[PDB]
Each structure stands twice: as C-alpha cells, then as structure tokens.
Structure 1
C-alpha cells in the first residue's frame, strides 16, 4: 500500500526501490497517480513535481519510473501536465521547472513523454514582485527559455 506521504518521501531521496511495489498497487485498487488524493490539496503538487523540486545533481530517476508508471495506466498525459493551483505558482508544470533549472535532459524527457509546450505558468510567482516577488518572463516555456537566455 501507498499514501501520498509514502511516495513523496521516496521521491525526496531518489529511491527507485520503495516504488518497486508501486505499479501493482494502483492496479489492484485501480487508483491513479493523478487522483485528488495523490496531490497536495492546496497547491496541486504531484510526485513528479516533488521529484522536480527534489533534484540532486540535476537528476532523479524517480521521474523516469514515475512517468513509466503513468503510461502503464496511461495517466500519462494529464500526469506530465498537471499544474499548480495556489495563487503563487499557479499553472506551473514540470516542464516549467526543468527549464527554470536549465536542464536540457529533463526538458527533453518531459517533451518526449508529452509535456504541453504551451502551458502558461501565470501565478504571482511569474509576474512582477509585490515584492513577492518575482519574476516575469511571461508564462510560456519558450518565453521562459528566451528570457533566461537559453
């Protein structure tokens, strides 16, 4: 069995083992990696997104496994494309983060598993400082990738 907490901890330390029994779990319960219960109820963060924050050397293969699991249930598209819902990071997707981190490899990977390239990150974190701040590029992956000189 797996609750939200269980996976998020596994992800935090790049553990691909504690997620050995993962796929077969939501096969029995037919639960989806995308269920309401597998996201933070106030931000909309998913395990993939936790993984995106918990990088070590711009690397995490909990990602590769996490994606793999989502296709086997074909949560695939809406999984890779889930966005933040809090006023701060609203509309931020994993692809936004990969770029923010200047990580070709993870941009490449996300685009190949079908990240929406037109997804607008539009929360207060992506507009001019309250100061909050900060910082605006606006919104769309291309725009980001240019404004950060990439």
Structure 2
C-alpha cells in the first residue's frame, strides 16, 4: 500500500495536511516502525515531525498534530514521541512543548500535557568557547519559566494547575534558577517589560502561597547563592528590584 518516508512525512506535516496521513498508522504497524525512529527525524537537529508540525501553523493550527499523537499512541510510542528532544545552535534538549509555548498555542500546550509531555524538560543553552559566552536567549530552561518570561499568564495557570501533570513553581534549572530568577534575568528596565515582569512575579508568588504555603519562593537560592532579589540588585535590574522591595514592605505592613 501507501509508503511513507521522511521527505513525504515532512512535506505532509509542513503543509499541515491531515488527509495526507491516511495510511500512516497502517504503514508503521505493518513495517514495525515508529515516528521516533532515526529515519523519521531530521538528522541535523533530531526533530521528529511533531516540532515540524508546530513550526508550520495556519492561523495557529496544524491538524496533523492530533493525528500524529494518536498514531504515536497506537504504536506504543506516545511518551517517547512527545518528549523527543532536538537541538539547534542555541539550545539542546528542546521539546515540542517548548515550541507550543513559544508559539503561544495554549490549545497545543494542553494537548501535549494531557498526553504526557515532560513539563520539566530543560532547553539547555549551547556554548562554543571554554566558558559560556551566552549566545542564546535565556529564559530559565523550563516550560513554566518560558511561559512566564514570554508573558503568558493563562499558560502559566494551566501548567501549574491542570488535572494531568503540573509544573512545579519551585523547580530550578541548571543554573539553580527558579521562575523568579528567570524573570529577573529577562528584565530590561523598559517600561512595558517592567510592567509585565512584576505582574507575573506577583502572580507566581500568589500561586506559590496557595499551592505551597510552607514555601517562600523568593528565598530559594540559585547556584551563585543569590535570591531573585539579590540577583536583581547585582545585575542592575532596578525596576523589578524596586518592585520586590515595595512588595515586601507592603506584605509586612499587612501582617502588622
């Protein structure tokens, strides 16, 4: 019957044609193949067809996505498919969930999480000199930290409170950075940046008080031994620094 190989599969998925996938499940089962196999991944990056789908949206949709996830499930391959990591010159360990978040697709975020996406997958920056020159946009590696740093509160809410698999507000990346440190890292002292960063910072604190009442999220230290406050002070992030200070003063007054 119908045959699928990498160029065919990638053409279908990049055009976003659900009908083109007719016969794919049967092909994989009959030939004992999986969408994670090396022959169906981009050799230069490790991308499966799932990231390719998410990078090729039409009005925020690519209807091959649900079909691919179903095929992966029916080939005993769903978790491996969803979480298959890829790299480019800037990050390694990137996953479909990171893309779904970055492209602002709350619907695909939900879809992936419900079906087993690793909510703590770390997109680690790549470097080429003996010490990290930081040629990548740093957002705290984690899906939750990406959602926060890109100003997506509804995705932040979903990731932390959905009924399938919750991202941990207290999680730290490879630098020891929590989502709060990540927000300090991306702060730039411009008016609109300070505006959304402080709102997101407060949102996360409110949430952490609800979900983890014995945790002071602001006290957790990164690998430089810095709290978000002190990181902010050291790296000259005045806007967020001043907001955190005023917030602690208001919180103290409220309890006294």
Alignment partner for residue 136 of structure 1, among 135, 138, 142?
138
Question: 2: distance between equivalents of 1:102 and 1:17?
Answer: 25
Q: Cα offset for 1:139?
A: 0.3
CA contact under 8 A between 1:77 and 1:115: conserved in structure 2?
yes
Moved over 6 A (4+): none
Alignment partner for residue 26 of structure 1, among 10, 25, 28?
28
CA contact under 8 A between 2:78 and 2:115: conserved in structure 1?
yes
Structure 1 equivalent of residue 177 of structure 2: none
CA contact under 8 A between 1:128 and 1:136: conserved in structure 2?
no
Question: 2: distance between equivalents of 1:149 and 1:100?
Answer: 10
Q: Which has the larger radius of gyration?
A: 2
How many residue pairs get aligned? The number is 146
Q: Which has the higher helix share?
A: 2
Structure 2 equivalent of residue 98 of structure 1: 100
CA contact under 8 A between 2:18 and 2:63: conserved in structure 1?
yes
1:121 aligns with 2:116: no
Question: 2: distance between equivalents of 1:22 and 1:59?
Answer: 20
Q: TM-score, normalised by structure 1?
A: 0.91
Structure 2 equivalent of residue 64 of structure 1: 66
Question: 2: distance between equivalents of 1:48 and 1:22?
Answer: 14
Q: Cα offset for 1:114?
A: 0.7
Unpaired runs of 5+ residues, structure 2, are 153-256
Deviates more, 1:84-93 or 1:22-31: 84-93
Structure 1 equivalent of residue 53 of structure 2: 51
1:7-50 residue CA offsets vs partner (Å, 9 max, x unmatched):
10001111111210100001111111111111011200110110
Q: Cα offset for 1:129?
A: 5.0
RMSD of Structure 2 on Structure 1 (CA): 1.7
1:5-44 counterparts in 2 under 5 A? Answer: 5-44=7-46
Question: 1: distance between equivalents of 2:150 and 2:19?
Answer: 36
